[model samples]
Target: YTYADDSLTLHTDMYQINMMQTYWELGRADLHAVFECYFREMPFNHGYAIFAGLERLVNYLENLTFTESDIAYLREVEEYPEDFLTYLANFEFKCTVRSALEGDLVFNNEPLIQIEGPLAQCQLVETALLNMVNFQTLIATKAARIKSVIGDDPLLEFGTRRAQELDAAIWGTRAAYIGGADATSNVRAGKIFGIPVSGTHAHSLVQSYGNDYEAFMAYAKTHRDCVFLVDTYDTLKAGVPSAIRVAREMGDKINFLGVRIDSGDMAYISKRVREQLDEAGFTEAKIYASNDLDENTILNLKMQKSKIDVWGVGTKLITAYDQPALGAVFKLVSIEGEDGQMKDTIKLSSNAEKVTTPGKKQVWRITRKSDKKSEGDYVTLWNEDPRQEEEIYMFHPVHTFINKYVRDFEARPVLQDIFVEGKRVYELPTLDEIKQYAKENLDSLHEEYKRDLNPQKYPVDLSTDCWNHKMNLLEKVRKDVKHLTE
Candidate 1:
C-alpha cells in the first residue's frame, strides 16, 4: 500500500481542468452531451426579453484556441503529463450550437441556446458562452423596456462615457441598438456595428464659449445638422430664445434640426420651450430631451403632455440602472453515460423554482393563426413538433391545473441552427435588419405582456413528455437517496 502524502499542486480550477483530465484518462472525452442555456427569471421583471449575443458568440467560438503562449504558460504552471498536455493542445472544439436569432423575443425558463457535442468540449465552453450572452441580453431587454415607453420617438444611447469599461461600452451599445434604440452617441460603436451615430454637444460647449448665442452660432457654422443643447443656461428665459435667435441668423445656411434639454423640470420647461420654438417659426424643429431620463420619467412626462419628440438615453439605459444582471444558467440536460446511451439529467433544489427540467428540448412559440398574436411559448422534447398537431394542449408546468386546448394556431420553432460541426451555418442580420426584427417581435406579443408594470405573465410550459421526464428523474433520485439513508 502506498502512503498518503499531503501536498497540493496549483493549476486551473478543479471544475474545469480536473474534470477534463478525468474524462481524458477514462477515454470518455468524446462522449455525446447536450447543454442548454436558459435564464431562470426575466431581467427587469419584463414579461419578455430581447435575445442578443449570437453574433458575439459566433465570433468568440470562431477563434477559440490554445495559442502557443497559452500552452507554454500551462506547461510551466504545473507538472501536467506530457500526453495530456499534447491532447490539450490538439483539442478540437467541435460542439454544434443552435440558438435563437438576435433581437428575437425570449421568455424565462425556456432554453435560449443549446450546445450538443463531445462532453469534454461542452464542459469547456460553458463559462465563455454564458459570459458573452448574459449581460448583453440584460442590457438588450433594458433598452427595449425603455423603448416601449418612448414608442418610435428616436431613442438615442448617450452612455459611452458612463459605461463600465471600453468593451462593455461598445458591445453594450451594440446590444442597445438591437433592443430598440434608434441611434447612438458613441461614434466608435457606430462605426464598428453600423449603428447610425448621433450627438449634439455637452454643457462644456456653451461653457467654453461663455455664452449660449456664440456657442449656438459657432456650432451652427461648424456643423450642418444643429440640435442646440439649451439647458446650459436659463432654459426658457435665455437658452431657447438664444437658440431661436441663432437659427434665424443662420437661416438656410445650417439645417436647424432642434434643441435638447439636459436639466430642469422636463415637463414644464419643455412646454414653454416648445412655444418659444414654434413662435419663432421653427415648428418644423423637433424637441429632444435628456438628463437622467428612464422609462418611469418618460412615462410621467408623457402624461404631463411634454412636447419632447426625441429621447437621449445615457446612464440609465446602458448600465441597466434598475437590474444590472440576468441570472441565466447553462445546464447539462442530456448526456451520454457509460452504458453508451443518452440519458436525461436534472438538477434538484429544495426550492421548487430552482429545480431544472430534464431532456434535450425545443421551444415552440405558438401564435394565433388568424391574428398573428402570440398565444404563449410551448416547450417540448426535441423529437416532438407541435406544428403537425391540429389541436394542442398548453399548460403551466408548475400550476398543472391551468391548461388550455387551442385550435387554429401556428407553432414556430424559436431556436434555429446557428452552427454545425463547428462551422457557422446561420446568416447574421445587419443592424437595421435586427432593429426591424425587434419591432416585429414586439408586435407579436399581446398588449398585456408588453406593459411597463405588472405585465401579464407570458406562459412558458413543458410538454407532456418533457414534464414526465423531469418527474421520473426526481422520483428515481428520491428512491435512491431513501435507500441510502434507510
Candidate 2:
C-alpha cells in the first residue's frame, strides 16, 4: 500500500515531462540551455529575503533517476513512446547548477540559481527547483523579519501541524533556524539537519492530568528543564498560580525554565505574569508567549512593553501567511544554436517587469572598500569581468538616469558553482555555520536597508555592457514582432 521505492525524480509537473518528450521528439534534446531562477518581488514585503533550499535542491539533483515503477506508471497512464521512456530510464544527471549560498541575502529580480545543461534535462527539473526554492525562501525571509523585531529574545518554530504538509514542517523549521529561530520543535529536523530541538509539555498534558499542578509536578519530576504552558484554563487566575506552586514545591529539583502564555492579550498578560513572577522571588523565571505571533504583532508587543522573554511562532511563520508564495520563475536565458554557438534568448512581455534578461550572467555584491558596506549589486554577462575594471559604472535597469560611478570597491560574486557536470563541487556548511553566515551577511548591510518599513532600496544594478546587451535584445524582439504584425 506504500510506495517504499518511490523516487524524487518524479517530483515535477506532468507538463515538464511532456516538454521533455517534445524536445526529445524534435531532436533538440541535446541543445545546451541556461536557465535562471529568480523571484519578481519580496515575500511578505520584508526589507530583505534570506536565500535557502540550496542544500535540498542539491540532494534532489544528486539522486535524480526514474525508478522502475515510475517508468511503468508513466507507460500505463500516458501514451509516451517506448524510446522516450527508455531515455528516461537511462537518464544521467549532467546539469550544472550554480546558486547563491544558503542563508545569503537575496534581492528581487536577481537570479538566485543558474542551471545549465541539455534542453531536455533542464526542462525536466524546472518544477522541483521552483517548488523547493520558493517555499523555503519564503519561510526563511519571514523568520528573519520576525527575528528582526524580537531582538535577542529566543524564537521557536512550532508549526508542524499547521504547516502545508510534512515536508513543509521539517524543511520549514530548518529554514526558520537559518532565518534566526533559536530552535525548532520538529524532532526529525533536529535529527536530520542537526538543528536545535526544543519543546515542553503541551495543553493536552494538562488536560490528561485534569489539573495544572499535577501536570506541572509530573513534568518537573521527569524533565530537568521545563517551561509550563500556563494558559490552559485561566492564565492569570489558575494556570500561573499552579505553575508557581509547582516550582516552589519542587524547589531545586527542576530547572523551572519558565511559563508559557499561549492565549489572551499577550502584552497585558505578559506584563502581569512578569510582575507576579518577580514578586514571588522567581524573577529569573522566563515568560514565553505564543499565539499566532508574527513580526508585526511582536513589534507591537515590544512597543507596549510586553515582558515576554521567548516567542513561539507557529502558523504565520511556517506557512508564510502574509505572502504565501515567493513567485520565483525559471526561464531560459541562453541556449546553444544550430551552428554550435551560444545564442542569447529573451522572453518579451507586455509587462515590463515580466521581460526576461538574456545571456548567462553573474551577480556581484559591490562593497565600498572604505566601510565594507555594500554599495549595490552589479550584474554582468558571464563573459564580462567587472573585477578587471578600475572604476565601475552602476545604473538602474529601469531608471537609467539613476547611476553612480564607484571607485576602489570590491566586487564579490554572490553565486558559486554548486554542481559541475552533475557532481557537487561546493562543500555544504553545517546548520550552525550557515546560521552564523546569515547573521554576518545581514550585518554587512547598512542599517538603512534593514528597516522593515520603507527601507531604502539597495540598488541591484546592471553593468553598462549588460544593460546595453539587454536593450539590444529587446529592440530586436520588438522589431521582429512589429514585422510579424505588419
After TM-score superposition, what is the CA distance of residue 207 in candidate 1 from its true location, in Å? 1.8
Off by over 4 Å in 2: 1-5
Worst 10 residues of 1 by lDDT: 1-10
TM-score of each: 0.95, 0.97
Q: Name the lDDT value of residue 358 in candidate 1.
A: 86
| Number of the top lDDT candidate | 2
Residue-by-residue lDDT tens digits, candidate 1, 1-486:
122222111112448766878888989889999999999887888989999888888887777766655555556665567777788788766889999998899989999999999988888777777877898898889998998899878999999889888877898999998898888888888788989899878899999989999999989889999999988778888888899999999899999999999888999888988898888899999999988999999999998999999999999998888887788889999989879989998888898668888888999999898988778999999999888999888889889999999789999999999889788888888878988898888887889999888999999988888888888899998898999999
Q: Model 2, poorest ten-residue lDDT window? A: 1-10
Model 2 TM: 0.97
List lDDT for all candidates, in order.
Answer: 0.86, 0.91
Q: How many Å off is the CA of 35 in candidate 1?
A: 0.6
Per-candidate clashes, comma-separated: 0, 0
